[PDB]
């Protein structure tokens, strides 16, 4: 209970999406809860130091990390912080200990075999620590004609085109250059005019400010509307194919809950658009969205129906 | 592994505290032998 708790302090939408669901009897919780669900470094004690502050202070800044790095390395340490703290000694004092003793102060034979010794014995225990086809299609002319349609390409008449071809051919034969007949006033009028605002190649015109029609609540209240049935429809849609009779019941399930939310949330929702009067048919979307899940679902059990005739 | 200067400081403190302090135990003898 505590961990499901801190998911839903976490994300209050989710919460107040969860209030929304679960309070308000649209899904059960153990539903709402089933669709939901370091290397080791070297450098932990060279760059691990004693900081030094301004006056005399000893930030050890002893995070767990550097701790538990240590224990993997050096399981001496965790036995001796098992068998002292908090006991025999408390862990400040140990770490100061240890600082102070010639484990972390290795530094003439002997005590360079001593180095050495240790130097090795560190890095056996850190690697030990670190364990623990040619195509060739057929039909190319496809991609000549893709996913374009079948065109209006109409071939003309018999040979009597060629003599229009000729025509052409004779008719721009002489040709000369003309200014006069470019254009005329009543073309240019009438090119205006088409291009004028409102006419027939200015499409259309100004619009409506949508914004300010819908508050902002209930814009918001609409977002989280179509947040919460793009779910419960992922989930549904996620189960189709339906291959196993519990995908079955699991849809069955899903339609109820969308139903279910439909009715608690959708329906009060509906009246608080239809008291203010907005003309916005923000609804229509849902409604268009819930009526296709819902004809998809008729049709596959049709389809169920009609397989085992 | 904090101001090691300060600890020399701290330890001939000391160490200067120990001299004093043998010093006056040492008097105080010559004067007790002395009186004996």
Same mark, same amino acid.
Do not use: E, K, W
């Given at each position: 209970l505590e961990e499901k708790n801190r998911m839903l302090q976490e994300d209050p939408v989710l919460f107040q999406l969860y209030k929304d669901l679960v309070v308000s009897q649209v899904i059960s919780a153990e539903e709402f809860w089933a669709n939901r669900l370091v290397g080791i470094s070297?450098?932990?004690?060279?760059?691990?130091r004693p900081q030094t502050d301004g006056?005399?202070? %000893?930030? *050890?800044?002893?995070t767990s990390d550097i701790i538990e790095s240590i224990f993997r390395t050096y399981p001496a340490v965790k036995m001796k912080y098992a068998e002292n703290? $908090?006991?025999?000694?408390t862990e400040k004092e140990f770490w100061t200990r240890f600082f102070q003793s010639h484990y972390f102060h290795r530094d003439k034979e002997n005590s360079n075999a001593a180095i050495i010794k240790r130097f090795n014995h560190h890095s056996a225990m850190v690697l030990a620590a670190g364990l623990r086809i040619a195509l060739n299609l057929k039909k190319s002319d496809r991609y000549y004609h893709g $996913?374009? $349609?079948?065109?209006? %390409?109409q071939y003309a008449t018999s040979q009597d085109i060629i003599n229009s071809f000729q025509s052409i051919r004779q008719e721009m034969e002489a040709y000369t250059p003309k200014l006069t007949?470019? %254009?005329?006033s009543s073309a240019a009028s009438s090119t205006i005019t088409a291009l004028s605002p409102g006419g027939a190649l200015m499409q259309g015109g100004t619009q409506q400010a949508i914004n300010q029609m819908v508050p902002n609540d209930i814009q918001s209240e609409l977002k989280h509307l179509y947040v919460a049935v793009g779910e419960l429809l992922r989930h549904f849609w996620s189960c189709?194919?339906?291959?196993?009779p519990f995908l079955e019941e699991k849809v069955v399930k899903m339609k109820s809950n969308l139903e279910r939310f439909q009715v608690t949330k959708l329906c009060p929702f509906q009246e608080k658009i239809r008291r203010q *009067?907005?003309?916005?048919? %923000?609804v229509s979307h849902i409604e268009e969205m819930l009526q296709t899940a819902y004809n998809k679902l008729h049709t596959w059990q049709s389809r169920r129906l009609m397989k085992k005739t | 592994i904090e101001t090691p200067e300060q600890a020399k400081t701290r330890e001939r403190s000391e160490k200067i505290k120990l001299e004093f302090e043998t010093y006056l135990r040492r008097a105080m003898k010559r004067f007790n032998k002395g009186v004996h």
């Open positions: 070297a450098a932990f004690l060279a760059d691990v006056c005399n202070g %000893l930030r *050890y800044n002893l703290v $908090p006991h025999n000694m $996913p374009t $349609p079948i065109q209006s %390409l007949q470019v %254009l005329s189709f194919p339906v291959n196993t *009067y907005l003309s916005t048919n %923000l | -």
